[PDB]
Design a protein around this ligand. Structure first.
Ligand SMILES: Nc1ncnc2c1ncn2[C@@H]1O[C@H](CSCC[C@H](N)C(=O)O)[C@@H](O)[C@H]1O
Length: 340
C-alpha cells in the first residue's frame, strides 16, 4: 500500500499535529475570541488586553488564521473570529472555550498526554508524573480544577440523578454507604425519595465539603452524614446497600478490584452492592485514552464489570439500563449480592 500526497497532508496538518491543539488551548485560555468581539481588532490591542508578548501573539494569531479559527489582519483588515472560531466565545453552548481552557481541569490534564509513551508501556496514568499528585487528589485540593471539571460533566446538572434514582426501589433500604459519592447528587436524590433512609458518603476533602452543603441545602443533614475517608482504606461503616456511582470507570482493573473488596467487606449480610455507571467511534476512544492517561481507568462493558465483581466475591442479581433526557449517555445500575 502506497501513501498519497493527501495522506501525508492529513498526517502533518491533522493526526500528527501537536502544535495546533496547543494554539487552540492558548487562544481559549487568553479569551482571544471574546476580546475581539468586545472591540479589539488589532494585534497590539489584543496583546494589550491579554498581557502577552506582541510579536509572539502575532505569530500565534498568524497560525490561528491559517487554520481557520481567526481571519483578517491583512498586513489592512480587522482581526476577527471565523464561523468555526466563534466556538471559543464564552457563551457558546458547546462550551469549547472551557474545554480548552488551561486553567480548567480537562485541558490541564490533557497536557499529561505528553507522557503517553509511558502510559502505553506501563498502563499507568501520566497525571501524577506531570503535576505531583494523582488526578482526584489534585482536584480535591484545588477547587478551581474541581469545579471546572464538574461544570463540563452532565452529571453536574440539576436533575441528572432523577432517572437512576427512579429505576431502583429504595423503600425498604435502611442505610446507603455511598463510596466516592462526590458532592452527593445520587445520594440526595435517593434520600428525597426514601424519607427513612440513612446515608454515609465517603469522599476526599474537596467533594466532601460540597456534599455537606448539598445535604444541608436539601434538609438531609439529620440522616445523611459525610465522612472524609480513603476508599482504599477499610470503610468506616457497614450498610445494607453500598453504592459506587460513576466511580469504577476511573480506576484500573487492579485498583477497582481493591475498592470492590473494600465495599463487600462493608456490606451487611443479605445486602446489595450497586454500581451505577455508563463519527461516534472517535469520541469514545478519545474519552477512553483521557480516562487512561488522567487516572488509569477505562469504560468497562457490562460483562467486564461482572467478572471484576466476581473476583471481589460478588454475584450478579439484576441489571437495568435506561436513558434520561439529561444525560448524553444511557445509564446502568448493576446489582450484586455477596456470593458468601
Ligand atoms: N481514595 C479515595 N477515597 C475516597 N474518594 C475518592 C478517592 N479517590 C477518588 N475519590 C473520589 O471519587 C469521585 C469520583 S467522580 C464522583 C462520583 C460520584 N459518586 C458521582 O455520582 O458522580 C471523586 O469525587 C473523587 O473525589
Amino acid at each position: 500500500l502506497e501513501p498519497t500526497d493527501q495522506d501525508l497532508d492529513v498526517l502533518l496538518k491533522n493526526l500528527g499535529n501537536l502544535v495546533t491543539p496547543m494554539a487552540l488551548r492558548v487562544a481559549a485560555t487568553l479569551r482571544l475570541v471574546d476580546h475581539l468581539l468586545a472591540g479589539a481588532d488589532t494585534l497590539a490591542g489584543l496583546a494589550d488586553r491579554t498581557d502577552t508578548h506582541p510579536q509572539a501573539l502575532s505569530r500565534l494569531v498568524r497560525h490561528l488564521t491559517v487554520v481557520g479559527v481567526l481571519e483578517g489582519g491583512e498586513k489592512g483588515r480587522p482581526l476577527r473570529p471565523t464561523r468555526l472560531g466563534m466556538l471559543l466565545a464564552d457563551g457558546h453552548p458547546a462550551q469549547q472555550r472551557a474545554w480548552l481552557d488551561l486553567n480548567g481541569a480537562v485541558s490541564h490534564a490533557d497536557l499529561a498526554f505528553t507522557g503517553l509513551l509511558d502510559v502505553v508501556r506501563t498502563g499507568r496514568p501520566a497525571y501524577a508524573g506531570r503535576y505531583g499528585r494523582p488526578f482526584w487528589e489534585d482536584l480535591s485540593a484545588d477547587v478551581a480544577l474541581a469545579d471546572s471539571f464538574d461544570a463540563l460533566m452532565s452529571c453536574d446538572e440539576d436533575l441528572a440523578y432523577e432517572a437512576p434514582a427512579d429505576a431502583y426501589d429504595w423503600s425498604a433500604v435502611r442505610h446507603v454507604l455511598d463510596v466516592g459519592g462526590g458532592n452527593g447528587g445520587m445520594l440526595a436524590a435517593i434520600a428525597l425519595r426514601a424519607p427513612h433512609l440513612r446515608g454515609t458518603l465517603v469522599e476526599l476533602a474537596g467533594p466532601a465539603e460540597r456534599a455537606r452543603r448539598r445535604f444541608a441545602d436539601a434538609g438531609l443533614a439529620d440522616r445523611v452524614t459525610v465522612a472524609e475517608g480513603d476508599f482504599f482504606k477499610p470503610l468506616p461503616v457497614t450498610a445494607d446497600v453500598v453504592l459506587l456511582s460513576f466511580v469504577l470507570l476511573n480506576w484500573s482493573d487492579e485498583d477497582a478490584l481493591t475498592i470492590l473488596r473494600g465495599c463487600v467487606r462493608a456490606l451487611e449480610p443479605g445486602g446489595r452492592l450497586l454500581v451505577l455507571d455508563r463519527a461516534d467511534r472517535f469520541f469514545s476512544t478519545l474519552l477512553d485514552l483521557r480516562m487512561l492517561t488522567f487516572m488509569g481507568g477505562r469504560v468497562r462493558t457490562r460483562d467486564e464489570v461482572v467478572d471484576l465483581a466476581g473476583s471481589a466475591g460478588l454475584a450478579l442479581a439484576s441489571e437495568r439500563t435506561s436513558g434520561s433526557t439529561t444525560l448524553p449517555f444511557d445509564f446502568s445500575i448493576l446489582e450484586f449480592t455477596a456470593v458468601s
